[PDB]
Coordinates of C-alpha atoms and ligand atoms in Angstrom, one line a residue:
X1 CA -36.7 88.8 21.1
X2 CA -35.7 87.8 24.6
X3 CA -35.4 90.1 27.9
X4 CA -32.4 89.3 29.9
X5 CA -32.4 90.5 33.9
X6 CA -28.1 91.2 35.4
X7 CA -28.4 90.9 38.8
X8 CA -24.5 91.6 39.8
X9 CA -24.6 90.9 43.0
X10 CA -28.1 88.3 44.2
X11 CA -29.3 87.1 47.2
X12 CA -31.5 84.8 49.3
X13 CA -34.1 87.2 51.0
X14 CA -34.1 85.5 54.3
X15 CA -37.8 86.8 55.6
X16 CA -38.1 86.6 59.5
X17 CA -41.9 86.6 60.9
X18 CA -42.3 88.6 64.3
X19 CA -44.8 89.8 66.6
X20 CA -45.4 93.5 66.6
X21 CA -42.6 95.5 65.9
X22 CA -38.5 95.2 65.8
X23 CA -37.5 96.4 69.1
X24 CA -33.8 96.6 69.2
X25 CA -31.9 95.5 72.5
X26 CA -34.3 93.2 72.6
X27 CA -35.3 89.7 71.9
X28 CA -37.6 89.1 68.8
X29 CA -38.6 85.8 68.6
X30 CA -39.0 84.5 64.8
X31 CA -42.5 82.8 64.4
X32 CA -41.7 81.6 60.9
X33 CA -38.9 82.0 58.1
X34 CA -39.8 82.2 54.5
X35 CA -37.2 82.5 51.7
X36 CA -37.0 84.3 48.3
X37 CA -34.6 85.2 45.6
X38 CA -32.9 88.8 46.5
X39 CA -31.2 91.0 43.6
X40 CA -33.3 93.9 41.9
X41 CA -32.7 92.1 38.4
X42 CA -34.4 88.6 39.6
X43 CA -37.4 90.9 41.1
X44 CA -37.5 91.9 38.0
X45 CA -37.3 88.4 36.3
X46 CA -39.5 87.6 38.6
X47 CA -42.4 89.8 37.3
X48 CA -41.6 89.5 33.7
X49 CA -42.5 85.8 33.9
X50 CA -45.8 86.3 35.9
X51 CA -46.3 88.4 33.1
X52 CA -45.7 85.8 30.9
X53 CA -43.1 87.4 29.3
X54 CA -39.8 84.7 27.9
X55 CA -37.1 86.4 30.0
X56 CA -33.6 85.4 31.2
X57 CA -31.5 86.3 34.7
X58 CA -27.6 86.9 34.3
X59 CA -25.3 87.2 37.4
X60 CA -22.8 85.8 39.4
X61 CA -23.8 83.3 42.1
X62 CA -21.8 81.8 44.8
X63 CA -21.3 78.0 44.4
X64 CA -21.4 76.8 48.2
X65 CA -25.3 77.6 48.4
X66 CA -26.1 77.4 45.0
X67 CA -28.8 74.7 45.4
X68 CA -30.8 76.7 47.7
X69 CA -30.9 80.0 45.5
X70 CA -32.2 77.5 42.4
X71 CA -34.0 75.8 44.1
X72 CA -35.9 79.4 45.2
X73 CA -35.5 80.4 41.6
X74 CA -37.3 77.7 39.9
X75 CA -40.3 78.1 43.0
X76 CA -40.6 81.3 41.2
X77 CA -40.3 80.8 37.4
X78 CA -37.2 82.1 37.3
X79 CA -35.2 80.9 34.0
X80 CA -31.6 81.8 34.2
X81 CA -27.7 81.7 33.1
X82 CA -25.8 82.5 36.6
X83 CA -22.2 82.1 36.3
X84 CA -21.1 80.1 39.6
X85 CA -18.2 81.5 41.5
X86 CA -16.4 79.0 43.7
X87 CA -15.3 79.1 47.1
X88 CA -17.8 81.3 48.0
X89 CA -22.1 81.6 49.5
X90 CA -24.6 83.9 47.3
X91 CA -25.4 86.8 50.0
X92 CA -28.0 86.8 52.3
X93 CA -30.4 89.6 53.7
X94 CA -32.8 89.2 56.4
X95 CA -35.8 91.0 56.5
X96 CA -37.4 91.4 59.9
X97 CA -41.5 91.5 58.9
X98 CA -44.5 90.6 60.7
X99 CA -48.3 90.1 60.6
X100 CA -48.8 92.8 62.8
X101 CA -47.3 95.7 61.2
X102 CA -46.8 97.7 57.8
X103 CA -43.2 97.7 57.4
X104 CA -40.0 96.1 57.2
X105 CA -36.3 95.9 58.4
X106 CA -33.5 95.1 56.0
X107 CA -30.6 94.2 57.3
X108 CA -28.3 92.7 53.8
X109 CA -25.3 91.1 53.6
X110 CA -22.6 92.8 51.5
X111 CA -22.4 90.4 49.1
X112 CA -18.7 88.2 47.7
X113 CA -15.4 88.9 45.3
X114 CA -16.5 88.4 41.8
X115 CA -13.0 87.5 40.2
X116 CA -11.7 88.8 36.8
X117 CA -12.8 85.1 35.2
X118 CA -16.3 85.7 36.1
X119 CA -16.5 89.9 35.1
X120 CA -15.4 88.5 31.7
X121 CA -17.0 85.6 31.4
X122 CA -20.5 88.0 32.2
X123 CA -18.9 90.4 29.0
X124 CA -18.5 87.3 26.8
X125 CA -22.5 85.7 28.0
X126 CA -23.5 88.8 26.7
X127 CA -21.4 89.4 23.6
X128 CA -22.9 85.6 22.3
X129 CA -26.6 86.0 23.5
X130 CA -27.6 89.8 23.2
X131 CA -28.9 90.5 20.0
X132 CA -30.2 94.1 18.6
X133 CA -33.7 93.0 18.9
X134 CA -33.4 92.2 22.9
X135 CA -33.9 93.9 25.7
X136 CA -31.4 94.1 28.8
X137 CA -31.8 95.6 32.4
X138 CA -28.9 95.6 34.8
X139 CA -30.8 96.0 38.1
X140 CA -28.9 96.4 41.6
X141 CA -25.8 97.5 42.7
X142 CA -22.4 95.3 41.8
X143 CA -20.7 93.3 45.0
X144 CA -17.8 94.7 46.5
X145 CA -14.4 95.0 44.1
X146 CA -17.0 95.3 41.4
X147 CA -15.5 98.6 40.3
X148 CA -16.9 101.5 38.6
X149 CA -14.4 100.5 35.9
X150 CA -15.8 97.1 35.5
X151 CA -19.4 98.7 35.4
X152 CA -18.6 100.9 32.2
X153 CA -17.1 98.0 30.7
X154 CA -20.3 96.4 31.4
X155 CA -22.7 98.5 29.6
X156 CA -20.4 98.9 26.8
X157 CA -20.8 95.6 26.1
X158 CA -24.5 96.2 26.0
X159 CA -24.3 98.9 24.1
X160 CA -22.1 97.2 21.7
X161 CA -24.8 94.7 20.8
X162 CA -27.2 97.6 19.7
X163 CA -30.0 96.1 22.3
X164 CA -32.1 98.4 24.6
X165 CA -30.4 98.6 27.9
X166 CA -32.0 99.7 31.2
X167 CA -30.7 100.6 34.2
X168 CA -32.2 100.7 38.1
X169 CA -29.1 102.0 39.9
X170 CA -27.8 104.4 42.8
X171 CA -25.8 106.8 43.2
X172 CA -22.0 106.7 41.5
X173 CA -23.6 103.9 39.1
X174 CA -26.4 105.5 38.2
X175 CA -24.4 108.6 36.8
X176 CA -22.3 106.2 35.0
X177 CA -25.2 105.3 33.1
X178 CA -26.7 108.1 32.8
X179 CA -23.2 109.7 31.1
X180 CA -23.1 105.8 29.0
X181 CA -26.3 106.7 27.5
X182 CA -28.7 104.2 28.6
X183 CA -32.6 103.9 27.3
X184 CA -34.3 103.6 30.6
X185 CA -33.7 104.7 34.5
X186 CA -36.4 105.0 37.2
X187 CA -34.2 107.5 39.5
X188 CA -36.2 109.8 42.5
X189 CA -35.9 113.4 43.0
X190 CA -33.0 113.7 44.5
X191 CA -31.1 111.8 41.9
X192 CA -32.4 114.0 39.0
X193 CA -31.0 116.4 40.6
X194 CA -27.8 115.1 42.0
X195 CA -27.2 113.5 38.1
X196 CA -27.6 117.4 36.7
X197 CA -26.0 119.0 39.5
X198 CA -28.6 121.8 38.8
X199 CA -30.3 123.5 41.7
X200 CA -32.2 126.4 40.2
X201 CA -34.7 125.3 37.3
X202 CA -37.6 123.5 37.9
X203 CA -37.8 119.2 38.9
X204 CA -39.8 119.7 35.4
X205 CA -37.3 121.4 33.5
X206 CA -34.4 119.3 35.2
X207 CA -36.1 116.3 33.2
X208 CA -37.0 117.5 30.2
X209 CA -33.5 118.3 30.1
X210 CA -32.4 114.8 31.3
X211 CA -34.9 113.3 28.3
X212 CA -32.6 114.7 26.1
X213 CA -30.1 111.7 26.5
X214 CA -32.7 108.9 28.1
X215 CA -35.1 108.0 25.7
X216 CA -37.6 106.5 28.9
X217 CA -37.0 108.4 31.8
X218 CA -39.2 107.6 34.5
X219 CA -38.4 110.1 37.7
X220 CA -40.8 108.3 40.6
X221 CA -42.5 111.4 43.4
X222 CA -42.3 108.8 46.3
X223 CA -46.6 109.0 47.0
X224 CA -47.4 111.4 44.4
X225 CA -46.6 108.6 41.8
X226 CA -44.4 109.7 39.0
X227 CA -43.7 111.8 36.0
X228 CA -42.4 109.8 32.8
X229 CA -40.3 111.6 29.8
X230 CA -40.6 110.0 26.2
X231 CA -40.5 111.2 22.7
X232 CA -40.6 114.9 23.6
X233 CA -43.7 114.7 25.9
X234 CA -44.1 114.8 29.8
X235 CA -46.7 113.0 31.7
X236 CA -47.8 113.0 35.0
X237 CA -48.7 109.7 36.6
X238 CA -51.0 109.8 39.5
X239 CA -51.4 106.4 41.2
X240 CA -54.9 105.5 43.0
X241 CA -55.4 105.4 46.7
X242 CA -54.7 102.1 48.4
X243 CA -54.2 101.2 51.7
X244 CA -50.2 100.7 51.7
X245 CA -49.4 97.3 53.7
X246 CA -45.9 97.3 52.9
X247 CA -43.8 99.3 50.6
X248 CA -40.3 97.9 50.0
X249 CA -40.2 96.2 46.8
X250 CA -42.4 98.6 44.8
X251 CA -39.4 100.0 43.0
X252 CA -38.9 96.5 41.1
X253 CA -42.0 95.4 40.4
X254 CA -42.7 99.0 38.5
X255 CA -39.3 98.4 36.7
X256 CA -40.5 94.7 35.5
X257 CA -44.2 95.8 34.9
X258 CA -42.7 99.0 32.8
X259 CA -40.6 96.7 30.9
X260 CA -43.2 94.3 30.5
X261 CA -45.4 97.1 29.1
X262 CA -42.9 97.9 26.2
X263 CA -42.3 94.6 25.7
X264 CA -45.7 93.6 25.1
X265 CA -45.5 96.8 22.7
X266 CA -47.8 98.8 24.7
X267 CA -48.6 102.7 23.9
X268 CA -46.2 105.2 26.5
X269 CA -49.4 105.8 28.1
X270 CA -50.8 102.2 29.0
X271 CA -47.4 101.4 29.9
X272 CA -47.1 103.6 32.4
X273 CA -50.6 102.5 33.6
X274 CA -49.9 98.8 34.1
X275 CA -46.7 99.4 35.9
X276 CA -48.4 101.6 38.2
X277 CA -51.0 99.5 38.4
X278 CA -48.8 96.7 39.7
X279 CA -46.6 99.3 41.9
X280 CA -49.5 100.1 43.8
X281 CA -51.0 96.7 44.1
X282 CA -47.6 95.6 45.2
X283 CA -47.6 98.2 48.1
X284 CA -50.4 96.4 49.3
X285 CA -49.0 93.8 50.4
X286 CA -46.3 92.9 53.1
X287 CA -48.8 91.7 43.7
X288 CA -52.4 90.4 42.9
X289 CA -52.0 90.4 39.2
X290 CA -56.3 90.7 39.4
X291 CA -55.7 93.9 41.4
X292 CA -53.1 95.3 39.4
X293 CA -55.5 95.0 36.2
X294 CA -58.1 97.1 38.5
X295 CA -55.7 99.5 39.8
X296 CA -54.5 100.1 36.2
X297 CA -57.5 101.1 35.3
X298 CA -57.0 103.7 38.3
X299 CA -54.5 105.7 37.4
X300 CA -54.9 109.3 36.0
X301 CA -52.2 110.2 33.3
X302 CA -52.0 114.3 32.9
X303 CA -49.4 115.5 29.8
X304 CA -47.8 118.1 31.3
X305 CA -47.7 121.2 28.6
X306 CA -44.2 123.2 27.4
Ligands
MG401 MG1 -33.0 115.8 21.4

């Protein structure tokens, strides 16, 4: 069995090196530029093959820059399919960084027209690759014109090929695939609730509820790590204390380490570990896949009773 990554709408993470902070109305000199792949489903990829694990990216690319994003792409492992739409540049989105500080500034481009030939063309990749044994996630939202319409077509397709889909979206998209009946979503708080509409029962009873049509539900607490629905139990996942350097892309690297787990046909339990494990090691950092073993072997797992 293969994993395959969508990422609907990629980009070239443009990274801009500063001194101290981004003051705005201001000039900030760049002291270097560094480039990598952009798109939660090449993340994703990304960590699957530092894993190890035989994975493929799907998406829609623009041809006019097309050289730079592979050339990126093979720099990180990345084995991929992209369908090329011409006439136009894969986005870009800078992220203002520097040595001196813990955070960072996105600031992404919007991303191109994916026309009809290329939305089919994606339905069709998948209709002649995707078999029941596979694994698919669809990470990221779609570019603009790539309608909510064209999303459900999407994981229909998945769906039709019997495969395990998973999903990291926002907002609209997110309930789409939630009501679509996916097998995996890492949504916060807010979106439990928002996806329910429910205001008065507990977080806890909002996802045990929530469990009952996503087989792997992972709902992530921000700081206080996670708690993690499957196969009628709850568990809570407390990550270990690390001195955070830069949390942005924590969110993907849980998603590919979580996949990577079940892939590797790990127990509910160790899954959950490892991708915390990674999570946190990745937080550190403006992942180590050395500290990620030892911070695996951090993290306190609580089953949550009732
Ligand atoms: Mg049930």
């Amino acid at each position: 069995s293969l994993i395959y990554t969508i990422t609907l709408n990629p980009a070239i993470d443009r990274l801009l090196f500063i001194r101290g902070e981004l003051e705005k109305r201001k000039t900030n000199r760049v002291i270097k530029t560094e480039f990598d792949c952009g798109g939660k489903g090449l993340h994703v990829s990304g960590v699957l093959s530092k894993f190890g694990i035989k994975n493929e990216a799907l998406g829609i690319a623009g041809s006019d820059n097309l050289d730079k994003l592979y050339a990126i792409l093979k720099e990180k492992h990345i084995n991929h399919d992209f369908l090329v739409e011409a006439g136009t540049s894969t986005r870009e989105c800078f992220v203002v960084l520097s040595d001196d500080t813990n955070g960072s500034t996105m600031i992404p481009e919007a991303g191109f027209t994916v026309s009809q030939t290329n939305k089919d063309n994606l339905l069709k990749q998948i209709a002649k690759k995707v078999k029941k044994e596979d694994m698919v996630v669809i990470a990221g939202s779609p570019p603009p014109h790539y309608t909510l319409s064209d999303f459900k077509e999407l994981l229909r397709t998945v769906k039709a090929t019997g495969a395990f889909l998973g999903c990291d979206n926002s907002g609209e998209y997110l309930n789409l695939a939630v009501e679509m009946g996916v097998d995996f979503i890492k949504p916060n708080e807010d979106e439990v609730i928002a996806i329910l509409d429910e205001k008065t029962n507990s977080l806890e009873e909002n996802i045990r509820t929530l469990a009952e049509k996503i087989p792997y539900l992972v709902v992530s607490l921000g700081a206080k790590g996670s708690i993690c629905a499957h196969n009628g139990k709850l568990y809570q996942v407390i990550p270990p204390k690390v001195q955070e350097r830069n949390d942005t892309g924590a969110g993907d690297v849980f998603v590919g380490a979580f996949i990577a787990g079940l892939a590797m046909n790990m127990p509910i339990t160790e899954t959950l570990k490892v991708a915390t494990g990674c999570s946190a090691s990745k937080v550190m950092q403006q992942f180590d896949l050395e500290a990620a073993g030892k911070l695996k072997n951090q993290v306190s797992i609580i089953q949550l009773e009732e």
